[PDB]
């Protein structure tokens with residue numbers, strides 16, 4: 001099954017998931033000079049005040065922070081979006097060194113990491129129905145770079161010893177995702193996909209222009225995680241990012 005190594009990596013995924021070479025695949029390079037400021041775009045609404053996290057899981061490709069999504073509690077609205085999208089989970093992709101790690105790129109510049117906050121369109125009733133829909137999902141993408149530590153991230157950095165290997169989860173209630181955002185909500189937006197199999201083309205991507213900075217020591221602990229399951233030989237969880245995919249004449253819009 002799919003991974004990020006030589007043999008099961010991003011190059012291979014088209015074999016089980018043909019949409020891997022589809023028409024609206026993610027991530028992409030964001031060429032700042034080609035993106036159009038779009039005046040028909042509403043303000044963005046991230047209402048993460050009443051977020052109910054439940055747990056952190058190592059699924060063997062990343063770790064997921066999972067939220068209670070059966071009421072309108074942590075929701076994205078506005079910008080390119082029609083209606084309400086509920087936060088289901090968040091996770092990151094990161095590199096082996098600071099010069100790589102992000103999935104999206106800005107003028108071919110790769111960031112040390114990248115955060116995804118994943119949301120589903122309410123009206124479809126559940127996350128499973130939503131993924132079968134062209135407007136089923138909304139993902140907030142936030143770049144990370146190395147500098148000063150992000151204090152809103154340390155809670156996550158500190159539970160990661162508990163979830164070293166695939167399968168493991170800890171309780172992770174009462175986490176506030178508002179502590180992961182940068183100060184500006186300027187974003188680029190385009191129609192796109194999930195970045196891991198099954199690569200469903202169900203995502204409106206909202207990618208923030210302003211990176212968050214984390215510490216060398218923060219990202220070092222991401223790199224101490226394992227892809228493998230307990231009692232298997234050690235495969236460091238690093239470089240779990242898909243590279244930039246062909247834009248195929250979709251237009252990336254800037255909110256700014």
Ligand SMILES: [Hg+2]
Pocket residue numbers: 131132133134135136200201202203
């Ligand atoms: Hg879809």
Ligand SMILES: [Zn+2]
Pocket residue numbers: 091092093116195
């Ligand atoms: Zn992701």
